[model samples]
Target: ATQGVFTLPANTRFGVTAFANSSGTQTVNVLVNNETAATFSGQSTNNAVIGTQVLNSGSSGKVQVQVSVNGRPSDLVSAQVILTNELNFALVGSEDGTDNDYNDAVVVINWPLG
Candidate 1:
């Protein structure tokens, strides 16, 4: 048996990698909150997406796969990512300070990267 679980802050992004090999072409969709987020089509051997999108208004969310054909079965999906937040620094100062030497205050912030 193989299984695992991980808990991360909401909005944390994740990646997905799946394989769909059968016959002809296949349509693979990455669904988030039961809504279509992305779509991939054609001869599918491997497909993936980095869900960098921020969390929805809901306190939670969901993700799953939808294939154009259901004959093939796939229970494996690879995912990898970390907190989607980014840290940015800002400084405020004026070269013309009362003293010959100037001073500045540093500020930090966290924002999501689109």
Candidate 2:
């Protein structure tokens, strides 16, 4: 799965996206900072599909996101998210699946401070 980290200022809105690729039906769950951010209600098609979530900045630190797919054999995909009041952030990616593949990405933006 693909992941991204961003340093957001206080009271900033960020947009994060994750993708998954599978041949058959699969259930993927998205987590933020080890918390359940979002979950896939349906199965993914043949092509790679994206799931998105919006997070508002509360504090400054490291925000972690994990993506897991449920199938014949459970597959886990995780990413360590980092966020600060700094100028920029980082992104990471991981993949762990047999037939069903996983790919995820995240994007964050920090609005100007008042």
Candidate 3:
């Protein structure tokens, strides 16, 4: 489960870093357009662990980050965090089956125009 899509501009202060190679507990959910814009539950310090949320340009649009394990609601996993300045950003990722084991990674930042 490797998912990423990024574009940031207006009033940007962003941070989203997630890496999971199968550990103990897991629940990562950050969504903007789909509501619920911040949530990282517990116990995943195996490889890489980071979760941050801040983007207020009137709540721009189209942003979604979802990684689920242990809480396995249909074995969920997703990633799409996009917010363009001129307004054009879209991201999508999904995995239901095929035994992909749900590996994941995403990093998006636009601080001081970096």
Number of the top-ranking candidate, with TM-score as the measure: 2
Q: Arrange candidates by TM-score, highest first: which order?
A: 2, 1, 3
TM-score against truth, every candidate: 0.39, 0.47, 0.29
lDDT of 1 by residue, 86-108 (tens): 33211111111233221111111
| True lDDT of residue 88, candidate 3 | 35
Pairing residues by index, what is the TM-score of model 3?
0.29
Candidate 2 — which pairs collide?
Answer: 1-94, 2-104
* Model 1 spans with C-alpha error above 4 angstroms: 1-9, 44-59, 70-114
lDDT of each: 0.34, 0.43, 0.47
Clashing pairs in 3: 1-103
User: How much is the lDDT of residue 109 in candidate 3?
Assistant: 34
Error of 3 at 25 (Å): 16
The alpha-carbon lDDT assigned to residue 36 of candidate 3 equals: 68
Query: Where is model 1 poorest over a 10-residue stretch in terms of lDDT?
Result: 101-110
Per-residue lDDT tens digits of candidate 3, residues 1-114? 534323344455455445444444556676655676677655443645555555533246345566555666324444333355333333322233355655432333333323
lDDT of 2 at 47: 38
